[PDB]
Design a protein around this ligand. Sequence first.
Ligand SMILES: [Zn+2]
Ligand SMILES: [Zn+2]
Ligand SMILES: [Zn+2]
Ligand SMILES: [Zn+2]
Lengths: 99, 93
Amino acid sequence: RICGVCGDRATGFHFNAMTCEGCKGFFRRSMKRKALFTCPFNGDCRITKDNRRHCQACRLKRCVDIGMMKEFILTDEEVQRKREMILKRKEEEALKDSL
Amino acid sequence: RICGVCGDRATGFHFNAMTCEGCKGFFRRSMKRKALFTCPFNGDCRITKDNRRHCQACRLKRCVDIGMMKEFILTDEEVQRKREMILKRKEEE
DNA sequence: CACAGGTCACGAAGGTCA
DNA sequence: TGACCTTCGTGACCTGTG
Ligand SMILES: [Zn+2]
Ligand SMILES: [Zn+2]
Ligand SMILES: [Zn+2]
Ligand SMILES: [Zn+2]
């Protein structure tokens, strides 16, 4: 029950790995942009709940090493059916709830 | 007695195929909702009790491939007429 | 018993805004 | 960034019928 990346209090599985709420958003936001990060120090930052915001290159690496699948991030094209086909069941759940 | 879709313990046939309770519910919802899934991998995932939740595309395709039949799911009109023969056979006993 | 559907607590996507 | 929130799909278990 602990975040595999930073050792923070994990909230459950996210993109197939047990991460905290912050490494969840960081992974999704990072991958969604395809951001390439480069490390300012060596390239083996010992990531923690505190300094986790300082080395992205390494945080995103510990991310992937831990098992997070960028495939599990919904494709913009998919965030679409969901966003819209929301009001599609809401339009039909309204129609049956009329007659 | 094994789910022909994910390997999990099965509870009997469901829509014509030996399946677990998760895949029966998955199959019925996916079919009723006319859902269109698309695999984020190579389209040949290996469904297993512990990852079936990750590829709906392949799970549903596996459902159909082992033989689950959408024609066994009751249509809403059949459901409605049912919970009427349940409300009739109720207010009659 | 076998098997349709029904229930609802619970997991994990995205969104939001300080 | 990330804490907290809204949504909807899941499946263990249950009811009702044939
Ligand atoms: Zn973390
Ligand atoms: Zn680093
Ligand atoms: Zn199954
Ligand atoms: Zn797949």
